[PDB]
Amino acid sequence: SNFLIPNGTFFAVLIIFLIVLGVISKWVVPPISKVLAER
Amino acid sequence: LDPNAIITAGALIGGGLIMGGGAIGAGIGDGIAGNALISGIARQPEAQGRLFTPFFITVGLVEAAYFINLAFMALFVFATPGLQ
Amino acid sequence: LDPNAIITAGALIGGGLIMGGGAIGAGIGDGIAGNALISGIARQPEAQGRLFTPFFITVGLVEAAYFINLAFMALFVFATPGLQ
Amino acid sequence: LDPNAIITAGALIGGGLIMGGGAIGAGIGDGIAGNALISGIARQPEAQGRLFTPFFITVGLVEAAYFINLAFMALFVFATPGLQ
Amino acid sequence: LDPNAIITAGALIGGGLIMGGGAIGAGIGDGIAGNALISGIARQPEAQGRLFTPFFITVGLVEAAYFINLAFMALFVFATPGLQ
Amino acid sequence: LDPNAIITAGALIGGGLIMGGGAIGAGIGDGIAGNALISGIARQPEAQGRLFTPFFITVGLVEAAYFINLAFMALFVFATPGLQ
Amino acid sequence: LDPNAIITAGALIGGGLIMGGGAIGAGIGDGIAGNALISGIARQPEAQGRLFTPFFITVGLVEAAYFINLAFMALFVFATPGLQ
Amino acid sequence: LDPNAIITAGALIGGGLIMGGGAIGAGIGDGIAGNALISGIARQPEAQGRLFTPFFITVGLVEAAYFINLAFMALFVFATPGLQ
Amino acid sequence: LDPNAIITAGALIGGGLIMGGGAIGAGIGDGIAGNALISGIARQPEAQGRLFTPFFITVGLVEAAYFINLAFMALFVFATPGLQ
Amino acid sequence: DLDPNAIITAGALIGGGLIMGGGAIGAGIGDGIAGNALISGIARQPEAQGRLFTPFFITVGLVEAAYFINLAFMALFVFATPGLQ
Amino acid sequence: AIHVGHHTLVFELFGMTFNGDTILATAVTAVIVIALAFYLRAKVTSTGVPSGVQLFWEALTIQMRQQIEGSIGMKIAPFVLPLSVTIFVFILISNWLAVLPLQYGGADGAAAELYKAPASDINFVLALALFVFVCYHAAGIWRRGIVGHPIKVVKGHVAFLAPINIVEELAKPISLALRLFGNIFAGGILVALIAMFPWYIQWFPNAVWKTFDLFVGLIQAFIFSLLTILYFSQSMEL
Amino acid sequence: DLNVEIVAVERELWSGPATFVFTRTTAGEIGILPRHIPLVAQLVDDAMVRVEREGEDDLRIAVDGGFLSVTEETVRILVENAQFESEIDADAAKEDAASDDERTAAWGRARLRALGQI
Amino acid sequence: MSIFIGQLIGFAVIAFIIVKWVVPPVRTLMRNQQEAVRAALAESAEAAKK
């Protein structure tokens, strides 16, 4: 149980991260910046 | 003597040293950074918030060493390299 | 010879190193943070309360490490990894 | 080579490390806090009354750790964990 | 007793020393540099921009040592030289 | 060999650690307190009478730790616990 | 058991000591030099370009010691003196 | 194996630790006290005679620990307690 | 086992201790001296040369001690005393 | 059947190594701190140079003293190992 | 028994292994983040009184925007603002979800958590750190050219320290991951270790450690995001 | 509460109770609270003084030739010249700032800092 | 199963501490932000009316 060797999970987790990034780079941050600019 | 006993005794000594050094470093660095922050606040009480950003950076960096060490400590005492 | 003897001797030495390093870190970090607190209270007595907010943070950031060390110290001397 | 002999030697070494670390940390931390207190009193002779309140706190947070170490050292030498 | 057992026990202790000392050094250096940075920012808030180029130079040096040690730690543990 | 020989060697190393750590702590803490005292007396010649009070307290703590360790050093090397 | 085993274990522990102390020295010295540099840049922003000339010397000098210690990784770990 | 061999080796290591700790404490404390003395004399030349009083006490305290350590080192090596 | 193996292992560990302590002392002392040199140069630029006379002296002292250790280390590993 | 002399010599070498490690740490740190004070004072008060050597040297004289004492005992540990046989 | 590692729901696919526990924890964190994002998007009040979700999101955006402006031109590297933000929240949630009381017993006397923070898994931290590494290295490539960027980093702030700079760069990703790893991995042990106590005394140390771990996780998320921003900035200069 | 006093070379400009006093000495930004230790510092060439009172808005002042003296009784700020927020005009704060003359530029920067736009 | 009870009591303590000390201040901060933005909007409306 080395628990330090990279596993296949490395890729999978990365994939999921990107999805979150995709939903935060397009549907969260731009609206927030627009709202702050409007204020 | 069973070789694995020697290996794991050496590993326990090694991990003890790992975390002894890590705790020394983390304690000293946290103390020094907190000293800087407390002195800055006492010297300018309203500056408090502005200091949290840099201070934590320092904390982070300091803690890095300690916690990085901690990881390898586990690697010494849970998956001992060179174990037979 | 019984391997467990070597296992527990190495574990005890490792836990001693754990706890010694933890004591070093805790003592020195608390001393430095307290030096900052004392100097600040001397400089700005009315900031006393406002100074405890950062000081404790520092103490926390220090004390946890010590207690973390303590925890692992127990892990060495009560459930020795790799024991056999 | 009695297992108990090896375990006792390891316990003694571990207790020695624990007390060495505790003494180093306690002595230096108390010295640093006392330095803060002495400088504060030298600058403001009458501030001493309000400088003991933080100073003692610091001393506590130092001595506590040291005394905690003490307890565990007594655990190592007398109630040696893992001793058979 | 096979030679490799003693070799690997010594190697694990050696690596423990390696990166325990590395962690102590990294913690001390990071704490000291961060204290400098926090004091500078507290005194000169507009200096935050110009206080990072030197700071992250010295930190860059400090961490270097530590990580170099880490590298050799691996060489001691995962590629133990002289290991029959 | 003789188990008591191993126990005595472990106890001697432990007590050496006791007093080495105690001496480091005492020396450094006393140096720090004395630096504070010297600076305070420099900046305030008449403060001497009112400075030795906190200074002693500082030293009183420091030496305490040291001498406490000394006592236990004796316990390690003169009435060795677990010395079968 | 063969003597090369004991000699190589001793060499590994010795090299761990060497460059662990080297890393402690390098980290602390570089941190202190960087503290000086950062404080100087904070107090005299224009002095930045002028402050490297002493700074690096210190760093270099400090680093020299570290690298000298690192040199004795080659002498100890790889080509062990007294190896038979 | 001769038990006297083990006991004497342990005593030699213990005395080495005794004197290492004593030397570290003495050097650090004396350096800090001298730093205070030199800074005080530089800031105010007139206090050259006034500062040497407290300074000596400081040094005294520091030196005491060292010499005490030395004494016990002799006890450890020349007349080893528990020798048999 | 070969007695020379034990002698050489002890000698290598001792030389590692010597060089580690020398590296710690030299690195930190050079760092402190360079810190004060950098501060002095930052306070005023014209002092550069005037400040190299004392700084060098200090570094000299520091380096000398370190180099002495080096010599003794060369004695330990190569001309191992009491090799028999 | 390892020679007792070998165990004594190994212990003596480790002990002396500790002696030098501690002595060098102390000497280096103390000299660095005293020198820091010296050069700070020189940077602030140039006219204090001749005045600042008398304390400085005292400091150094004390620091090195401890160091050299350690050196002496190191020799006694290595070349005249007490309990040697 | 501590059972360090021992990933649950581990499976195999395409000639490579996957840790079911880490995948599940990361997916749950992503679901929480997505739910918060859509709660914000549905209920954006450009003119009305903002709700808690909008307040939190705008506070995070303001903090990260301030960090970027202080470090590098906010109009030079806008893409850092989202990335940083998401990282923060991601890590934060991944840690805060551990505060729940999901640690049961497997009848062997050793604790087992239904949910384990993914940052205790080397794969999660490695993914985050290496993604940040490639991201800001590519940003430096764009901002300084394919040839200038490696040369600039090799030279560093002072040319004569060329070797150290190399190591420094190699230290940036690793330091980012292991640090985080440790800060969370230790927790996975402490709670497990606290399980060794009986309930009537286990309750208190567990409560104290989890309370502190809340702050530890928040601080680690903040540090990861801030160091990501700062590394981005150091790679986009001149 | 502590007594603040902004006093010019010619006429004392202001005096009264306050709860906090922020300014920028040559060493660095300093905040003074009631029982601050005795202190004597020099305000930065383009210093600004912000006096926070109780129940009233912060009073912001641009200072030329500053000197701060904190005493156990009261806090005093000495100015070769000083202008309040109301008595400062943005335009001349701009043309005066960015001028070649060192003192002119410093006075302009101090006026801008007192205004708030910096 | 005992460790489950221990963690449950610990989480009850954590929740009590939160709702006792952390929730009030953060709720007040949220209310302050809401009131600040509301006052800004009201001021804008009043400015247009003026």
Numbering used by the authors:
A (entry chain b): 22 to 60
B (entry chain L), C (entry chain T), D (entry chain S), E (entry chain M), F (entry chain R), G (entry chain N), ...: 3 to 86
J (entry chain P): 2 to 86
K (entry chain a): 10 to 247
L (entry chain H): 3 to 120
M (entry chain d): 1 to 50
Reproduce text from the manuscript describing this model:
Extensive classification of the data for the mycobacterial ATP synthase revealed the presence of not only the three main states referred to as S1, S2, and S3 but also of substates within them. Substates S1a to S1e are in S1, and S3a to S3c are in S3. In S2 (where there are no resolved substates) the c-ring has traveled two c-monomers further round (ca.120°), and in state 3 substates S3a to S3c have all traveled on to approximately the same position, four c-monomers (or ca. 280°) further on. Again, the position of the PS suggests that the order of substates is either S3c > S3a > S3b or S3b > S3a > S3c. The main differences between the substates within each state are that the positions of the PS and F1 domains vary such that the F1-domain (including the α-helical coiled-coil of the γ-subunit) appears to pivot around the PS during the catalytic cycle. However, alignment of the substates via the “crown” in the F1-domain shows that they have identical nucleotide occupancies and that the position of the γ-subunit is also maintained. Alignment of the substates via the a-subunit demonstrates that the c9-rings and the membrane α-helices of the a-, b-, and bδ-subunits of the substates are in identical positions, as are the ε-subunits, and in some instances the lower part of the γ-subunit. Each nucleotide binding site in the three α-subunits and in subunit βTP is occupied by an ATP molecule with an accompanying Mg2+ ion, while the site in subunit βDP has ADP and an accompanying Mg2+ ion. The sixth nucleotide binding site in subunit βE contains an ADP molecule with neither accompanying Mg2+ nor phosphate.
The membrane domain of the mycobacterial ATP synthase is embedded in the IPM, with the catalytic F1-domain of the enzyme extending into the bacterial cytoplasm and attached to the membrane domain by a central stalk and a peripheral stalk (PS). As do other ATP synthases in eubacteria, chloroplasts, and mitochondria, the enzyme couples a proton-motive force (pmf) across the IPM generated by respiration to the synthesis in the F1-domain of the enzyme of ATP from adenosine diphosphate (ADP) and phosphate by a mechanical rotary mechanism. The mycobacterial rotor consists of a membrane-bound ring of nine c-subunits, attached to an elongated central stalk, made of single copies of the γ- and ε-subunits. The mycobacterial PS is made of two proteins, bδ and b′.
